[PDB]
Amino acid sequence: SGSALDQLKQFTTVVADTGDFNAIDEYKPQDATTNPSLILAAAQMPAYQELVEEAIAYGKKLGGPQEEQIKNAIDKLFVLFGAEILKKIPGRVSTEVDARLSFDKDAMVARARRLIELYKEAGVGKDRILIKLSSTWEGIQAGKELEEQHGIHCNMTLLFSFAQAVACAEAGVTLISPFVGRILDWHVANTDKKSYEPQGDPGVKSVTKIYNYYKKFGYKTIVMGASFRNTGEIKALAGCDFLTISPKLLGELLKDNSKLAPALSVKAAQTSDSEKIHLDEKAFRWLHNEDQMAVEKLSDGIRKFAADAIKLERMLTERMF
């Protein structure tokens, strides 16, 4: 069973990145992560229409204007998928609060507590939940507050710049989801190089820098590389605390028999060069702005998740009204 997947598991905790809960346990992941785009995709599958129907019933039950009924249905839907996923894994599932709240700290904290409450009603303790939030300054502060004030653990996503990584570390959030694949995308579409080797992959370099910094300075926030375009990127990050991978690439790793070696370790990180820095809001916003790719990928990532949430909403509205 010496597949690249089984080998990877010796150095990194594997996480499944999908809303399709029937395609998980094959890869035996510890945790699982979902996002608006993944839920939208799964909610469109014939095999999960019962969850959609149940979510619609819930929205109607609480009443109010269509926007309210749709809001409750979508939250119920995210939680239904989360609850089903938890039956396929022994760990945690990440559930993301609507991206349209990415610049509203208080609204994110409120929506996070609402989801948690919905999970509780489903018989799920918050110990098995990771509330996912956009890594904007307000999202990061919402995470800090959720962690400290409510014991609600968060997964900071759409993490592209070093500024975001530092802010998350200082905020003490449970976990960060620094992207790899979308960073490669930006470089392909914005530079004179369309191909990169694993170690040279811009996304790999980003996570590598973040990992080393976190470990060198002892931050306990979990580093989970996310978003992948190929298995090379994943292998180049062997050793990272966690790695959330789509079922497609997990299947590929399961069929790969090449020998894999750890590329990241705490011991080696303690030798890295990055200097420690502290960031208040001002410093964070400036340093983030210095990373063009990050500014653009965080911005576009928020718009895409909002767009997908709206698509899911149009789907629901058409059926419940």
Which burial class, exposed, middle or buried, applies to 107 when counting CB atoms under 10 A from its CB (0-12, 13-18, 19+)?
Answer: middle
Task: Return the percent helix, strand and coil in the chain, to nearest 5.
Answer: 60, 10, 30
| Residue 161 DSSP label | S
Cα distances from 174 to residues 15, 82, 132, 307, in angstroms, run 15, 18, 11, 27
Identify the three-state secondary structure at position 163: helix
Kindly state the tokens that stand for 129.
């939940």
Q: Which residue has the tokens 């749709």?
A: 70
- CA nearest neighbour of 311 among 105, 98, 133, 95: 98
Kindly state the tokens that stand for 139.
């999202």
Identify the three-state secondary structure at position 207: helix
- Domain of residue 236 covers 1-321
Q: What is the CATH number of the domain that holds 37?
A: 3.20.20.70
Q: Which residue has the tokens 């990415």?
A: 102
Q: In terms of C-beta distances under 8 Å and separation of at least 24 residues, what long-range contacts does 55-62 make, across chains too?
A: 55/80, 55/316, 56/316, 56/319, 56/320, 59/316, 59/320, 60/320
Total domains, the chain:
1
Residues known to be catalytic? 132
> Resolution of this entry in Å?
2.1
Residues 6+ apart with CB under 8 A from 303: none
Which burial class, exposed, middle or buried, applies to 292 when counting CB atoms under 10 A from its CB (0-12, 13-18, 19+)?
Answer: exposed
Identify the three-state secondary structure at position 151: coil
> In sequence order, what DSSP letters do the residues of 240-292 get, joined into one string?
SSEEEE-HHHHHHHHH--S-------HHHHTT--PPP----HHHHHHHHHT-H
In Å, the largest CA–CA distance within the chain is 60
Identify the three-state secondary structure at position 130: strand
Is the separation of the CB atoms in 79 and 118 below 8 Å? Answer: yes
Structure-determination approach: X-ray
Identify the three-state secondary structure at position 77: helix
